[PDB]
Design a protein around this motif. Sequence first.
Motif, short mmCIF file in Angstrom:
data_model
loop_
_atom_site.label_atom_id
_atom_site.label_comp_id
_atom_site.label_asym_id
_atom_site.label_seq_id
_atom_site.Cartn_x
_atom_site.Cartn_y
_atom_site.Cartn_z
N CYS A 245 9.59 -0.62 -3.89
CA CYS A 245 9.24 -0.62 -2.48
C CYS A 245 8.26 -1.72 -2.11
CB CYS A 245 8.66 0.75 -2.09
SG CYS A 245 9.04 1.27 -0.41
N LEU B 42 5.90 10.42 -13.42
CA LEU B 42 4.93 9.35 -13.24
C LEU B 42 5.55 7.98 -13.50
CD1 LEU B 42 1.26 9.18 -13.96
CD2 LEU B 42 2.65 7.57 -15.25
N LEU C 87 9.28 3.20 -8.34
CA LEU C 87 9.55 3.29 -6.91
C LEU C 87 8.51 2.53 -6.10
CD1 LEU C 87 10.91 6.85 -6.15
CD2 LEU C 87 11.67 4.71 -5.11
N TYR D 77 0.51 2.77 1.84
CA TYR D 77 0.69 3.80 0.83
C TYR D 77 1.15 3.24 -0.51
CZ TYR D 77 0.02 7.76 3.99
OH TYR D 77 -0.52 8.69 4.85
N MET E 266 3.62 0.84 6.11
CA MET E 266 4.31 1.00 4.84
C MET E 266 3.41 0.62 3.68
SD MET E 266 8.22 -0.28 5.43
CE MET E 266 9.53 0.84 5.88
N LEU F 207 -3.45 11.86 -17.11
CA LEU F 207 -3.92 12.48 -15.88
C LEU F 207 -5.12 11.72 -15.34
CD1 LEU F 207 -2.10 14.73 -15.32
CD2 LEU F 207 -2.73 15.03 -17.71
N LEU G 215 -3.00 4.96 -15.93
CA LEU G 215 -2.17 6.10 -16.32
C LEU G 215 -1.06 5.71 -17.29
CD1 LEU G 215 -3.74 8.08 -15.13
CD2 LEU G 215 -2.54 7.73 -12.98
N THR H 232 14.16 4.35 2.38
CA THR H 232 13.65 4.34 1.02
C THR H 232 12.17 4.70 0.96
OG1 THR H 232 15.27 2.62 0.50
CG2 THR H 232 13.49 2.97 -1.09
N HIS H 233 11.40 4.33 1.97
CA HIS H 233 9.97 4.63 1.98
C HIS H 233 9.67 6.07 2.36
CE1 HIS H 233 5.63 4.05 2.90
NE2 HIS H 233 5.74 3.09 2.00
N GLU I 40 4.66 14.83 -4.13
CA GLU I 40 4.99 15.83 -5.15
C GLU I 40 4.46 15.43 -6.52
OE1 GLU I 40 8.78 14.30 -7.42
OE2 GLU I 40 7.07 15.59 -7.88
N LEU I 41 4.23 14.14 -6.75
CA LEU I 41 3.60 13.70 -7.99
C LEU I 41 2.10 13.97 -7.97
CD1 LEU I 41 2.26 11.12 -9.82
CD2 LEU I 41 4.04 12.63 -10.70
N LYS J 122 8.02 11.52 -2.98
CA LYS J 122 7.79 11.50 -4.42
C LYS J 122 6.31 11.33 -4.74
CE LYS J 122 11.97 11.42 -6.54
NZ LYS J 122 12.24 11.79 -7.96
N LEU J 123 5.61 10.51 -3.96
CA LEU J 123 4.18 10.31 -4.20
C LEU J 123 3.39 11.59 -3.93
CD1 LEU J 123 1.95 7.37 -3.66
CD2 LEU J 123 1.38 9.35 -2.29
N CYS K 235 -1.06 19.98 -13.56
CA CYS K 235 -1.19 19.72 -14.99
C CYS K 235 -2.64 19.54 -15.42
CB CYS K 235 -0.37 18.49 -15.37
SG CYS K 235 0.34 18.55 -17.02
N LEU L 20 1.76 17.48 -9.05
CA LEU L 20 2.04 17.68 -10.47
C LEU L 20 0.86 17.27 -11.33
CD1 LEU L 20 5.77 16.82 -11.11
CD2 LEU L 20 4.47 18.64 -12.21
N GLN L 21 0.07 16.29 -10.88
CA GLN L 21 -1.13 15.91 -11.62
C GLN L 21 -2.17 17.02 -11.57
OE1 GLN L 21 -2.13 12.08 -9.71
NE2 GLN L 21 -1.22 11.10 -11.51
N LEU M 124 8.01 7.18 -10.62
CA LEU M 124 7.25 6.88 -9.41
C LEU M 124 6.62 5.49 -9.49
CD1 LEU M 124 4.29 7.19 -7.69
CD2 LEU M 124 6.51 7.78 -6.71
N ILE N 184 14.85 0.45 3.87
CA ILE N 184 13.52 0.65 3.30
C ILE N 184 12.80 1.76 4.04
CG2 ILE N 184 13.04 -1.48 2.06
CD1 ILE N 184 12.08 -2.69 4.67
N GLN N 185 12.94 1.81 5.37
CA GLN N 185 12.43 2.95 6.12
C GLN N 185 12.98 4.25 5.57
OE1 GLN N 185 10.56 4.35 8.33
NE2 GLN N 185 9.36 2.63 9.12
N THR O 49 5.84 21.10 -19.52
CA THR O 49 5.49 20.65 -18.18
C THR O 49 4.97 19.22 -18.17
OG1 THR O 49 4.96 22.94 -17.61
CG2 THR O 49 4.15 21.22 -16.13
N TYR P 235 6.36 15.45 -16.27
CA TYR P 235 5.40 14.78 -15.40
C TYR P 235 5.28 13.30 -15.72
CZ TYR P 235 0.79 12.83 -14.58
OH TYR P 235 -0.26 11.99 -14.28
N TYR Q 141 9.92 7.96 -0.99
CA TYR Q 141 8.85 7.57 -1.90
C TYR Q 141 7.55 8.31 -1.62
CZ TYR Q 141 4.68 4.89 -2.98
OH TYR Q 141 3.41 4.51 -3.35
N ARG Q 142 7.12 8.33 -0.36
CA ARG Q 142 5.95 9.12 0.01
C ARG Q 142 6.17 10.60 -0.23
NH1 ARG Q 142 4.87 9.66 4.79
NH2 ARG Q 142 2.58 9.69 4.84
#
Lengths: 313, 313
Positions: free
Chosen positions: A39, A29, A35, A89, A86, B90, B110, B21-22, B31-32, B28-29, B39, B35-36, A32, B18-19, A21, A25, B25-26
């Motif tokens: 962005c 990470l 990305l 974040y 935008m 982490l 990180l 693409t963004h 779901e990441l 992915k941000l 984990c 995952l932290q 991300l 980008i709208q 897992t 990650y 990303y948020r």
Amino acid sequence: LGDCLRNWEDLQQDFQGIQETHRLYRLKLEELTKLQANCTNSITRQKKRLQELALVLKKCRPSLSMEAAQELENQMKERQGLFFDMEAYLPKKNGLYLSLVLGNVNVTLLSKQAKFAYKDEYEKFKLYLTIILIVISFTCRFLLNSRVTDAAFNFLLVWYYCTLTIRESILINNGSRIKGWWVFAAYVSTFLSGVMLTWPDGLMYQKFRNQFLSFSMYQSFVQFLQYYYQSGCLYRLRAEGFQSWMWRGLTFLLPFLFFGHFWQLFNALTLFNLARDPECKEWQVLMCGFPFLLLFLGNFFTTLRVVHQKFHS
Amino acid sequence: LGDCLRNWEDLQQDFQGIQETHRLYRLKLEELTKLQANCTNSITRQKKRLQELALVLKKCRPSLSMEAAQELENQMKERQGLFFDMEAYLPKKNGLYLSLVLGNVNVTLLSKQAKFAYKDEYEKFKLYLTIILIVISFTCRFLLNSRVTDAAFNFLLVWYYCTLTIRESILINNGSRIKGWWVFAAYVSTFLSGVMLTWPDGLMYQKFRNQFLSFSMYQSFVQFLQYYYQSGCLYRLRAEGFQSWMWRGLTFLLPFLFFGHFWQLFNALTLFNLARDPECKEWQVLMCGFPFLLLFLGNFFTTLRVVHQKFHS
Ligand SMILES: CC(C)(COP(=O)(O)OP(=O)(O)OC[C@H]1O[C@@H](n2cnc3c(N)ncnc32)[C@H](O)[C@@H]1OP(=O)(O)O)[C@@H](O)C(=O)NCCC(=O)NCCS
Ligand SMILES: CC(C)(COP(=O)(O)OP(=O)(O)OC[C@H]1O[C@@H](n2cnc3c(N)ncnc32)[C@H](O)[C@@H]1OP(=O)(O)O)[C@@H](O)C(=O)NCCC(=O)NCCS
């Protein structure tokens, strides 16, 4: 023993799992972290190109469908504001002050609930140190006419205003519209309380001791009303009727702000009449009257500005 | 004009991008960010369960193949260290000190290149402020026998040691093995330089002024040798022959560390012989001799510890 390893293996059976897992990650990470940079260069090169479009438009509107051209103004006023939501974040980069104190760590909260939860922690911080700065400045003023305890109050005042500059600099890059003065009034107050430690106990110190101490005891009382307004403005902005509260907490705040701004003015003129006295021998008399004169004109002519912009809105 | 909007649309042909693409990303941000936390709870509940396995084993090895039981040790000695390289990517949570100064922002880098790049910026920081603390403490010592400039040196010393505690606290949670003393020797030095501002210019101050100033001018010179060793141990650990440098930079550092530890001892006994003098009337004489006595026993008996562990390895 035997079972002592039996439980040792029932726990490492899934240590292959987290090891599995934790691979998927650090891969997430790292993809991300690209990305974000992707962005970031893409909304910063368009924005610097966007304002270029504005200047190419700004020169023609005076020379010139009068509004058919400025119909492009509101078209890039919200978009440049769309870039701001935008970029809220995306991780920013520290300013000249945070790169000094903290280095190049990232301090931007990448959520909207995290900027809230940090600005709530910031208002509670100023409240908890206001209960200390009003208990330590009351003994100093009334209970103990000492100098080791008066220098312990100015060391808290210095540390409290240095922690504000750090916390107001982490707010400023995480989307806060703090006017330039309020972040400078903390450097002026750290200085004013710094030159308050170097002030040798004598005859001029005991003539301004009661004024400074009973002001910074009032300045803490007004930070109890600032808290309940400031924390009521951020717990209601999260969720018409908000301008009925904002124009009520403000009406009950301005008299206590202007009684404080005209106490800084009074505290400045005093240190200017303590200088003209022959029994004065300390530069700290003059070098406190100027901060109290800055903090007057800066705070007063900014609180008036804040009410001059809220009156129109 | 016409083309003035033609370039307005050729620049927003990708603002839909980008709208788009963004959004991805948020997502992915978010779901990441789960995952932290996923984990983090999974390697912290196993670790607290791992030590439980050790105590269930630790009680039997005295009472008891006895090495087949202790081969479980190295089975969870690196395993718990395997968790340490996991937990290094982490986000941690701030300690009691960083939550005070900074709040609940995240300060853990990180990456492994980001912990390096931050510990390099930290060594360069201590070097750049060492060039200021050796230029301001040389004028103070030799060029200017003043008190407004001596109090400006202690305000830098206070700010420099307060910025170290912050930067050594961001190192400590991003994987640094800084011994407990070195992070405390900065709180002791901020205090010692804090009670150095409250010290009224008089007869005892001018008798310790030359000692303190010429020591903190030496203590900056030894931070030039600490830099070239610390930054040489940091750029070589990234990439046998490393113990030939480590046992060479150390051999040329210890004499300059023990001449500094025995100057703090000498600086303490002085403030103890300045107290027994009747012309002394200031508590700041005694309350500096104790920090110089802490900083002696703390620094000396820790530098010996560091060499007592490097001798065995
Ligand atoms: C009017 C006042 C009370 C607050 O009004 P306000 O609506 O919060 O101010 P703004 O509309 O300009 O908002 C500016 C932003 O920075 C915050 N802000 C306002 N004043 C601030 C201050 N002194 N310090 C830090 N932040 C402040 C606001 O919360 C807001 O944050 P946000 O938009 O990110 O959520 C303001 O004048 C004030 O705080 N004055 C204090 C000065 C003082 O202490 N005088 C007495 C000295 S004895
Ligand atoms: C021996 C010495 C010079 C450095 O040896 P070292 O190998 O770096 O120390 P360690 O092996 O224990 O490593 C501890 C960790 O914290 C760092 N470290 C060591 N001493 C440190 C110190 N004073 N301050 C901050 N960090 C220190 C190390 O770089 C290392 O970092 P890392 O493992 O995350 O990369 C150490 O004794 C020292 O720095 N003493 C300075 C005290 C002093 O200034 N005395 C004179 C006063 S006048």
